[PDB]
Each structure stands twice: as structure tokens, then as C-alpha cells.
Amino acid sequence: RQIKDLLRLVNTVVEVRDARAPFATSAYGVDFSRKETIILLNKVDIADEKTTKKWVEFFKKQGKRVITTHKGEPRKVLLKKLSFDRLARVLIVGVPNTGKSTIINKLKGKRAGIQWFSLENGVKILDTPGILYKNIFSEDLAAKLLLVGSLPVERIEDQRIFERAFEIFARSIGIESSFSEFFEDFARKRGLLKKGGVPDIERALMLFFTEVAQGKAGRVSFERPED
Ligand SMILES: Nc1nc2c(ncn2[C@@H]2O[C@H](COP(=O)(O)OP(=O)(O)OP(=O)(O)O)[C@@H](O)[C@H]2O)c(=O)[nH]1
């Protein structure tokens, strides 16, 4: 609804997704089939490269406008990829944490309610992204949204979502150890003890998933189009 308000102001939409989880970070629920929509697969720098290419092929086959990029990509390569039409008025949209502010700041640079900023060719872009929250009752979706850091650990109330997330992590990296062992070792290995000198698993989970989202646990993707 807040987002629906924002959509009446624009004709073009950039959906910023995480390349590691292009389905989980889709903007399902909100309708922008009336807009010109670009699927932007962000953070390819911390994603499994062959999985990224397979997502590109997949979205292409469905006749969708899709690009890939990351923080380090020069502004000029991003604009080149996006190739906005002359009359474009653009909304940057996505679920939390996918890199929407980072992209706006790149698009802005040293450039001057919600206000537009203009590219050198007149194209307008809202300076604030629309944040989409979507409905989560599948365990798998929660787990994937946790892995990309779109969903807070605080907001996870079932331990099986932590185990799902870890199963996805382990499988897609190589690990084969048990959940409980991994996180006991992780909590010691990181100095996370509670009263009595007992490993703080809660904190281990929070820190670990934070480091996974941040790409600090290896170049890893969490879903594949074959899945
Ligand atoms: N490795 C990597 N990290 C990125 C990339 N883009 C953004 N980030 C990081 O991801 C985190 C969140 O990015 P933001 O740009 O703040 O994303 P956002 O969508 O505006 O986040 P929300 O405000 O929660 O909706 C930050 O720590 C960024 O540094 C990327 O392309 N590669």
C-alpha cells in the first residue's frame, strides 16, 4: 500500500534481488506488471558464479529483463546495463537488505517528501527505495531470507528454520556435520560463552547468519533454477 502509492509516481521499476537467492528475494505480492520492470541480480561478487549464470539464462527464457551487478561495479557499467529509456521515471524496489540504498547512492553520486534525482540524460529516479515485506509461511523461504539477511534472527521463532538455513548452507558449500556440533564449535571458536562458561548457541546463530549474509563464509548461492 505504501509501495502502491509510490508506484503511481513511476513508469519503471528496478527489482533489486540477491543473486544467491533470486526466488526468495523476488517481489512476489506486489503488482508491477503495468510498469517496465528490470530484474537486478545484486551481490554477484559473493554468489556462486555458475549458479548466477544459470539464473540469468532462466529469467531470459521467461522473456524477462534481467541484469547482474555488485557494489564494486563502476556506475557507468551499471547505467550501461540498465539502459533506461528517455522517459523513465524509476522506483528502486526490493525486500530488505538486497542493496537498494547502495545502488541509489551509486546512481546519485555527488548529486542533489520523496524527491527525484536526475541522470545526466534527464532520467528520473526516486531517491528512496520501496521496501517490500512478503508473507512467510514456508520454512524454506524464511531460511533463505535469513541466509541473505533479509529476515532478522530475532524474528525467527522456530528452531527448524535455523536448521533448514544450515542444511541449505552445508549442502551448497560441502559441510556434512550436524547442526548442534557445528554451532557448539562455532560458539567456542568465536568466544561466545554464556554464564557458567556454556557456549552461547543463540549468539552463534546470529553472528553466523550475519556473516553468511555478508558473504564472509565463502562464495555461496542458496538456490538454483533446477530446484
Ligand atoms: N558483498 C556485497 N555486499 C553488498 C552489495 N550491495 C550491498 N551490500 C551490503 O549489503 C548490506 C545492506 O545493503 P543496503 O544497500 O543497505 O541494502 P538495502 O536494500 O537498502 O537495505 P534495507 O535498508 O534494509 O532495505 C550492506 O552492508 C552493504 O554494504 C554487493 O553488491 N556485494
Curated annotation (Swiss-Prot):
Gene3D superfamilies recorded: 1.10.1580.10, P-loop containing nucleotide triphosphate hydrolases
GO CC term (a single one): cytoplasm
Entry annotated with the keyword Nucleus: no
Binding positions for GTP per the UniProt entry: N42, K43, V44, D45, N97, T98, G99, K100, S101, T102, G130
Compartment(s) where it occurs, according to its Swiss-Prot or TrEMBL record: Cytoplasm
Main subcellular localisation: cytoplasm
Keyword Repressor: no
GO biological process terms held by the UniProt record: translation
Keywords assigned: Cytoplasm, GTP-binding, Nucleotide-binding
Residue span, CP-type G domain: 1-134
Classification via InterPro entries: G_CP_dom (IPR030378), GTP-bd (IPR006073), GTP-bd_ortho_bundle_sf (IPR023179), GTP-bd_ribosome_bgen (IPR019991), GTPase_MTG1 (IPR016478), P-loop_NTPase (IPR027417)
GO molecular function list: GTP binding; GTPase activity
CDD domains given in the database record: YlqF (cd01856)
PANTHER family referenced in this protein's UniProt entry, alphabetically: MITOCHONDRIAL RIBOSOME-ASSOCIATED GTPASE 1
Function as written in the Swiss-Prot or TrEMBL entry: Required for a late step of 50S ribosomal subunit assembly. Has GTPase activity. Binds to the 23S rRNA.
Family, per entry: Belongs to the TRAFAC class YlqF/YawG GTPase family. MTG1 subfamily.
Protein name: Ribosome biogenesis GTPase A
Gene that specifies this protein: rbgA
